Design a protein around this nucleic acid. Structure first.
Ligand SMILES: [K+]
Ligand SMILES: [K+]
Ligand SMILES: [K+]
Ligand SMILES: [K+]
Ligand SMILES: [K+]
Ligand SMILES: [K+]
Ligand SMILES: [K+]
Ligand SMILES: [K+]
Ligand SMILES: [K+]
Ligand SMILES: [K+]
Ligand SMILES: [K+]
Ligand SMILES: [K+]
Ligand SMILES: [K+]
Ligand SMILES: [K+]
Ligand SMILES: [K+]
Ligand SMILES: [K+]
Ligand SMILES: [K+]
Ligand SMILES: [K+]
Ligand SMILES: [K+]
Ligand SMILES: [K+]
Ligand SMILES: [K+]
Ligand SMILES: [K+]
Ligand SMILES: [K+]
Ligand SMILES: [K+]
Ligand SMILES: [K+]
Ligand SMILES: [K+]
Ligand SMILES: [K+]
Ligand SMILES: [K+]
Ligand SMILES: [K+]
Ligand SMILES: [K+]
Ligand SMILES: [K+]
Ligand SMILES: [K+]
Ligand SMILES: [K+]
Ligand SMILES: [K+]
Ligand SMILES: [K+]
Ligand SMILES: [K+]
Ligand SMILES: [K+]
Ligand SMILES: [K+]
Ligand SMILES: [K+]
Ligand SMILES: [K+]
Ligand SMILES: [K+]
Ligand SMILES: [K+]
Ligand SMILES: [K+]
Ligand SMILES: [K+]
Ligand SMILES: [K+]
Ligand SMILES: [K+]
Ligand SMILES: [K+]
Ligand SMILES: [K+]
Ligand SMILES: [K+]
Ligand SMILES: [K+]
Ligand SMILES: [K+]
Ligand SMILES: [K+]
Ligand SMILES: [K+]
Ligand SMILES: [K+]
Ligand SMILES: [K+]
Ligand SMILES: [K+]
Ligand SMILES: [K+]
Ligand SMILES: [K+]
Ligand SMILES: [K+]
Ligand SMILES: [K+]
Ligand SMILES: [K+]
Ligand SMILES: [K+]
Ligand SMILES: [K+]
Ligand SMILES: [K+]
Ligand SMILES: [Mg+2]
Ligand SMILES: [Mg+2]
Ligand SMILES: [Mg+2]
Ligand SMILES: [Mg+2]
Ligand SMILES: [Mg+2]
Ligand SMILES: [Mg+2]
Ligand SMILES: [Mg+2]
Ligand SMILES: [Mg+2]
Ligand SMILES: [Mg+2]
Ligand SMILES: [Mg+2]
Ligand SMILES: [Mg+2]
Ligand SMILES: [Mg+2]
Ligand SMILES: [Mg+2]
Ligand SMILES: [Mg+2]
Ligand SMILES: [Mg+2]
Ligand SMILES: [Mg+2]
Ligand SMILES: [Mg+2]
Ligand SMILES: [Mg+2]
Ligand SMILES: [Mg+2]
Ligand SMILES: [Mg+2]
Ligand SMILES: [Mg+2]
Ligand SMILES: [Mg+2]
Ligand SMILES: [Mg+2]
Ligand SMILES: [Mg+2]
Ligand SMILES: [Mg+2]
Ligand SMILES: [Mg+2]
Ligand SMILES: [Mg+2]
Ligand SMILES: [Mg+2]
Ligand SMILES: [Mg+2]
Ligand SMILES: [Mg+2]
Ligand SMILES: [Mg+2]
Ligand SMILES: [Mg+2]
Ligand SMILES: [Mg+2]
Ligand SMILES: [Mg+2]
Ligand SMILES: [Mg+2]
Ligand SMILES: [Mg+2]
Ligand SMILES: [Mg+2]
Ligand SMILES: [Mg+2]
Ligand SMILES: [Mg+2]
Lengths: 49, 50, 56, 94
RNA sequence: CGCGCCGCGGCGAGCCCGAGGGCCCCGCGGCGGAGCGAGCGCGAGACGCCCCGGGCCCGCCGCGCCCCUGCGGGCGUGC
RNA sequence: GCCCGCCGCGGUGCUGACGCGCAGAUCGCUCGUCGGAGCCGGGCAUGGGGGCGAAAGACUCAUCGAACCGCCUGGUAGCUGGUUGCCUCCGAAAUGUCUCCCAGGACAGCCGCCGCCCGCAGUUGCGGCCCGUAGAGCGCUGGCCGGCGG
RNA sequence: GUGGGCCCCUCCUGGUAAGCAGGACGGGCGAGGCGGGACGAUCCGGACGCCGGGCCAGGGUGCGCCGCCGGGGCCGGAACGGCGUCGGCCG
RNA sequence: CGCGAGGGCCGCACCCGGCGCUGGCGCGACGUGAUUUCUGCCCAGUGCCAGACCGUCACCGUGAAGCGAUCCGCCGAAGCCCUGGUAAACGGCGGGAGUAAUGACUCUCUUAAGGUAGCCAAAUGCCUCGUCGGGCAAUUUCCGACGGCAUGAAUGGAC
RNA sequence: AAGACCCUUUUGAGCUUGACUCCAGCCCGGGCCUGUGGGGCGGGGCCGCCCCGCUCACCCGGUCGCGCGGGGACCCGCCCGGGCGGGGAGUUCGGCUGGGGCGGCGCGCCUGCUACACCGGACCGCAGGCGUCCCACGGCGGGCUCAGCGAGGACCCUCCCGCGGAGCAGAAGGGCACAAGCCCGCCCGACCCGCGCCCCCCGUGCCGGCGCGGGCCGCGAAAGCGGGGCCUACCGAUCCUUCGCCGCCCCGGCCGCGGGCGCGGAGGUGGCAGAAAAGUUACCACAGGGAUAACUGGCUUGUGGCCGCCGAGCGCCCGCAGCGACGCGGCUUUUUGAUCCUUCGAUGUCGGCUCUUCCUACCGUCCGCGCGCACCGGCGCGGAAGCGUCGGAUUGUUCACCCGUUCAAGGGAUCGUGAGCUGGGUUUAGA
RNA sequence: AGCGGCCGCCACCA
C-alpha cells in the first residue's frame, strides 16, 4: 500500500488502503497472488482447541 | 504495470542465498552393509557454528 | 462555437442572373399520366386512317 | 387486438375468394448449411476474436405480427401483416 | 499508370511500329461490328438533311386465339 | 544503533553570492551525523515493458510515467507556415439537402471556357381568379369596471 | 473557386439593456479608385484606359485653407422649475 | 494466511532453474507500527473457503432413424447453482412524536447491525471570527472547557 | 519558449476496472504413449462403468554402483475438449451547446402561434403532442337525431322549441345534420396483378397520401360506394437469416438428396440516409485555436452607489428647522453581473511595502446664509481640493473588529506600481 | 432461445 499502482496490486489511492478484499483464490496467476492466499478464515479469535 | 517483487526473486541474481564460508550440507551417515547387519562407531571431533 | 443557421439574403439575385428558365415546349404535350383507355383508342384510330397510317 | 378465426379472401391458386384459416407466423431455426452461415463459420476460425459486428442499441419494444392464411379448398398460403401492437390473439371458432 | 471529356492527323465496317522474325520490310490477340435476360436462352427495319418528339420492332414479365415435329411453333394484346 | 566535537560523509537556513557563471547545480557563512542499518577503493553479478528500488514513479553514463543507436521512414495529418515573369479579356461565394456532420466534404446554385442550332422581358396598361396582415370591432372563443328596471 | 460573412434602410423575436444574440424585401463593403463627412472597410455624391479644354454633384465659402455677397426675422440629456427676451390664443 | 517435499511460492520459448549447503524455533505472502491501557456491534452485499451431487454444464463414447452427408436421444469432469463457515477480509455501524426550561420515560416506523469505550470547532466543524473562561490597553491567532456538514477503535482508539 | 491553463482534432500515451474483443499460465476430462493377470456392479438382447494384484515399459532416491531401495501401468509428455484468468495485449469511450461540464433533447415526425394577407423564412423561441389503441371502435344499406332550456308527471316517462351550443379513440386546428354522429341487418375493398403523380426536395431516397388499367368480391330495389378507423403525426437501406409462390442452374453425362438464383414479406438500426465500444491523469502530453473560457480594456447598467421632482404624513401647535411613505425622472462606472470585439509562435496573474500625481460626490480647518440658533454644543445649505486625515492588537487578507491619540472623508492612474522588492495567499511535481 | 422447476445455469454476425 506504500507503492504506486504500477508496482503492486495494492498501490495507489488518495488514502493508503487496499480497496478490495485481500483474500485471493488458489488459482490466481503469478503477479496476482498477493495478500492472503486461499484463506479458510481470518481475524483474531480464541476458542481453538 | 511492471514485474512485482515476488516475481523478481525467482530469477536468482541478488536473491540467491549467502553460502560463502558455510561448513557444508548436514546429513545422516549413509546406510551401508555394516550398518544393516550391525553397528559402526564414530567419535565426536568438534561442535561448530554454521 | 456557433455559426449562422439560415439566410436567403442573396438567393433571389442568384435566381435571376441567368433569367428565369422555362420548361421545354414538348413537356406540355407529354402523354405521361393520361388515361390508357384514351391512349389506346388514339393509336387504333390513326393506324386505320390511310392519310395517317404508317404501316408498310 | 383480436383477429378472426376464419376469413374469406382471394386465393391465387384458384383465382377467386375462398375461406382461409388463421395462424401465427414464426421465424424458423437457422440452418447450418446456408451460405452466409458457412462464410461466417470459416471467418471465425483461428486467432483474432470477433470478426463481425454485434448489435447492441435496441429501441423498439414491438414487432410486426403476421398472420398465415391457409386456404381451405386447396392449401395455398397467404400472409397478412398487422400494425404494431402489444397483444394479439386469434379467435377460436371453426 | 488508370478513368472521363475536348481538339487535331491517318485510315474507315473496319482498325492496329504485340511479342518476335528478316528511322526500312513482315508480324496474333484485342477493340469495334447486337442487344437484352439471374438463368434455361431468345434476338432487332417503318418512317426521318440535322436536332426534338411521335409511331413501330428485339429481350425480360404477364396474358386471347389457332397448330405441325408439342410445357414446342405461329398470330395477337398490356404496363 | 549514548552525548559534545576534527577529518570524512551529507546538504538545513540566509528564500545570501552567482544567475551574458569559476560552474549545463558552483561558492560563503550557518547547519545534520561522526563506533553504527557507518564511510571509501578495486574485482564481480543483474539489460529495456526488462533490471534495480528503507517506495520519491526514484535510478539505469547531462537521457526515464519506459534508455541509447541504425533501419522500417521522405511514417500519416480534415491542422499551422511558404509556394518565383508581363500585358489583355471575363468574373464569384460566404446559401439549400445529406453526412460520427459542426475548423472537412458530396450533390444543387453562382462563374469561366469550348461550342452547336433557328420571337424575348425582375416593366406599365387592360381583363379574370387567390390571400386574412395593418386598421376596425365585441357577433364567436375568452377576459373585464359599474349604473338603472323587473 | 465558394459552402466562418458583415454593415445600412425599412419590418420583427428573446433580453433592463448592449458596438448583445437570432430572422425578412432591396442595397452596399467584401472584391469599388476619386471628392466631401477634421479624423473611420460600409454614411453623402459619383463607380475607374493615358492626356488637353469646358461644365458642375455632394459639401461648403473670417485666417489656417481652394471659394460670398445682398435681404427679412431671432439671439449629449429627463421629470420639473424661470416677473430673461420676442411673438401669439382665450376670456 | 499458505505449505510436511510425489509439496508450496516464483523463474522460464524449449531443455532446464531460484528459495535450497534449506525442513515448521523453517520458508514464503500480507497488514498494523516501541512502551502503558485497550481493541465493541454487523456474514444481508462483495471476496475467500469446505461438503453435497439438485438443476445446468464439453469433446469423447453409445442407442434409434437414414442411400449417405447428417438429424434426434442417452451418458455427464471441473465450474456455477445449493448447504454451511469466516470482519487484526473489503467494508458498514437511525428516524418521528410526546413526557417530571431539560427529558430519566413512553408509543411508533424501521436495519445485516443501528457507533460501544474513548477523543474533539483537532493537521478532521459547513454554518464559523461557534459559546464561555484564561492571558493582552486592545487578539479571525493560542491554551482550557462545552458537544460531531462528515470523530471512533491493528482504516487501529486513547495516553 | 510555435501557452504547460481552457477548448477543438474522428492526434497520443501512463494508470484503472462491472468497457469491448482476446492471450499466457493454471485446474479438469477422454484418448495415444501401454504390459501381464484376477474380480464386482449395472444395463441391452454384447455394451458401459468401477475395484486390486504382479513387473517388464516409464519415473524417483542411495552408492566411489563395497556387498541397496521406493513407486508403477497410474503419473508425467503429447492431441482434442470445457472452466478460471486486468497477470498481460490491442482498441473504444457520440453530437448539439451565447466556452466546456452538470442539466435538457427542434438528433426522426405532428398541430396552433412567432411570420409582417402567394410560397418560403432563424433561435437551448411560446403552448403542447407521437413510438400506441380497435374483427370493430372497420365496409355498405336503411332508419333516426344530438347537447340542452322551458313546462308537466306515484314514493325514468311526455310534449314543445332546438345551426350543433353533443358526438366523431388519444395534441391542436379544420370538417360534418333525412350526416361523417346513434341504432339495426348483412358482410371482410384492413384483398390480387401492373403503373403513374403530390408533399418534403438536389426536384434522390424514406414515411404518408392521391389518381388509374385489369382480376375477384361485399352491401344495396337500383344509381352508386368500398385498397381500414373524416382530414393534417403514429416509423426503417446494403450484407445476412427466415418463410411463401412459379420455375430455372449445379458447366463430361444421367437419377435421388442437398445447395444456389429471379419475385415478395418478416427479424433493425429512436444518435431515426442506419460504426460493434467504459473510466482516470495534480505524472503527462501533440497539432492547432483569440472561430472559445480564466485576468486588463471596450459597449451595457439589471444589481451596487449617488442626486432630483411631488407632498400622505411625522415634528405640543405647525406639510417643507429637520424629516418624508405611495409613486415618478435622471446620473456614475470606485460593486457584481450580461456579452465575447482585441490578445493563446505568452501584455508576468492577489496583497503589502515604497513613491508620485490626479478627481470632488467636502470629514476637520476658511468665507457667507438658515434653525424647533439664549450661551455652550449640535444640525441643514452654497462657494471652496491649500494643508490635514495618524500609532497599535488578531487576520495573507482588500474588508472587517476593537484599544489609543490633535478623535481621523471617499475615489482614480493596465482592479497605478514584480528586469523595484517581498512571496504570506492563490497556482505543478512530496505528504 | 435452450433446458429444468416467476426462479436458477447456459447460449449470442441482420
Ligand atoms: K490502493
Ligand atoms: K508486468
Ligand atoms: K510489464
Ligand atoms: K506482472
Ligand atoms: K521490475
Ligand atoms: K442462403
Ligand atoms: K476468431
Ligand atoms: K429474367
Ligand atoms: K563535520
Ligand atoms: K546581499
Ligand atoms: K555547491
Ligand atoms: K558521538
Ligand atoms: K535477474
Ligand atoms: K543489467
Ligand atoms: K523499458
Ligand atoms: K527504447
Ligand atoms: K536513426
Ligand atoms: K529495420
Ligand atoms: K491528423
Ligand atoms: K494535425
Ligand atoms: K514552416
Ligand atoms: K467521434
Ligand atoms: K457541413
Ligand atoms: K474537419
Ligand atoms: K467543392
Ligand atoms: K366578445
Ligand atoms: K436578462
Ligand atoms: K460591389
Ligand atoms: K418664454
Ligand atoms: K488487516
Ligand atoms: K512488521
Ligand atoms: K496501542
Ligand atoms: K457480510
Ligand atoms: K454467511
Ligand atoms: K459473506
Ligand atoms: K460518541
Ligand atoms: K483547544
Ligand atoms: K469510520
Ligand atoms: K496550446
Ligand atoms: K495547452
Ligand atoms: K477555451
Ligand atoms: K490543453
Ligand atoms: K491531429
Ligand atoms: K487521440
Ligand atoms: K502519458
Ligand atoms: K507516458
Ligand atoms: K494500465
Ligand atoms: K485479465
Ligand atoms: K486505453
Ligand atoms: K430542387
Ligand atoms: K408524413
Ligand atoms: K385497381
Ligand atoms: K435489410
Ligand atoms: K429474403
Ligand atoms: K502546436
Ligand atoms: K479553432
Ligand atoms: K479567427
Ligand atoms: K473574429
Ligand atoms: K450607463
Ligand atoms: K475573446
Ligand atoms: K474577452
Ligand atoms: K493568451
Ligand atoms: K503580443
Ligand atoms: K476642504
Ligand atoms: Mg508515494
Ligand atoms: Mg495492476
Ligand atoms: Mg436563372
Ligand atoms: Mg385456394
Ligand atoms: Mg551516536
Ligand atoms: Mg552527536
Ligand atoms: Mg537564493
Ligand atoms: Mg517513426
Ligand atoms: Mg515525418
Ligand atoms: Mg466586367
Ligand atoms: Mg456560412
Ligand atoms: Mg452514420
Ligand atoms: Mg451514424
Ligand atoms: Mg455583432
Ligand atoms: Mg475574404
Ligand atoms: Mg480626408
Ligand atoms: Mg482665402
Ligand atoms: Mg501505517
Ligand atoms: Mg475491529
Ligand atoms: Mg478514520
Ligand atoms: Mg500554440
Ligand atoms: Mg507547444
Ligand atoms: Mg470529424
Ligand atoms: Mg490513446
Ligand atoms: Mg492510455
Ligand atoms: Mg489494458
Ligand atoms: Mg462538442
Ligand atoms: Mg384515409
Ligand atoms: Mg441521420
Ligand atoms: Mg506522484
Ligand atoms: Mg473573439
Ligand atoms: Mg444603475
Ligand atoms: Mg471569441
Ligand atoms: Mg514577456
Ligand atoms: Mg512588460
Ligand atoms: Mg494592478
Ligand atoms: Mg515595471
Ligand atoms: Mg520579478
Ligand atoms: Mg502539491
Amino acid at each position: 500500500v506504500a507503492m504506486n499502482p504500477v508496482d503492486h496490486p495494492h498501490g495507489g489511492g488518495n488514502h493508503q488502503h487496499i480497496g478490495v478484499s485481500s483474500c485471493v483464490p488458489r488459482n490466481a496467476v503469478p503477479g496476482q497472488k498477493v495478500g492472503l492466499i486461499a484463506a479458510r478464515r481470518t481475524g483474531c479469535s480464541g476458542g481453538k482447541r | 504495470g511492471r514485474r512485482i517483487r515476488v516475481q523478481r526473486k525467482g530469477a536468482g541474481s541478488v536473491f540467491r542465498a549467502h553460502v560463502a564460508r558455510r561448513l557444508g550440507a548436514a546429513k545422516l551417515r549413509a546406510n551401508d552393509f555394516a550398518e544393516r547387519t550391525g553397528s559402526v562407531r564414530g567419535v565426536v571431533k568438534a561442535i561448530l557454528h554454521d | 462555437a456557433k455559426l449562422k443557421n439560415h439566410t436567403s439574403k442573396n438567393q433571389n439575385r442568384k435566381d435571376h442572373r441567368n433569367g428565369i428558365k422555362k420548361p421545354k415546349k414538348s413537356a406540355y404535350t407529354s402523354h405521361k399520366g393520361m388515361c390508357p383507355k384514351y391512349l389506346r383508342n388514339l393509336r387504333r384510330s390513326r393506324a386505320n386512317d390511310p392519310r395517317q397510317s404508317l404501316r408498310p | 387486438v383480436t383477429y378472426p378465426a376464419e376469413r374469406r379472401t382471394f386465393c391465387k391458386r384458384e383465382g377467386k375468394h375462398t375461406v382461409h384459416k388463421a395462424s401465427l407466423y414464426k421465424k424458423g431455426k437457422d440452418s447450418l448449411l446456408a451460405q452466409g452461415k458457412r462464410r461466417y463459420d470459416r471467418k471465425q476460425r483461428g486467432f483474432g476474436g470477433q470478426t463481425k459486428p454485434i448489435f447492441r442499441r435496441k429501441a423498439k419494444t414491438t414487432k410486426k405480427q403476421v398472420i398465415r392464411l391457409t386456404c381451405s379448398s386447396c392449401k395455398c398460403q397467404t400472409f397478412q401483416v398487422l400494425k404494431r401492437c402489444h397483444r394479439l390473439e386469434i379467435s377460436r371458432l371453426g
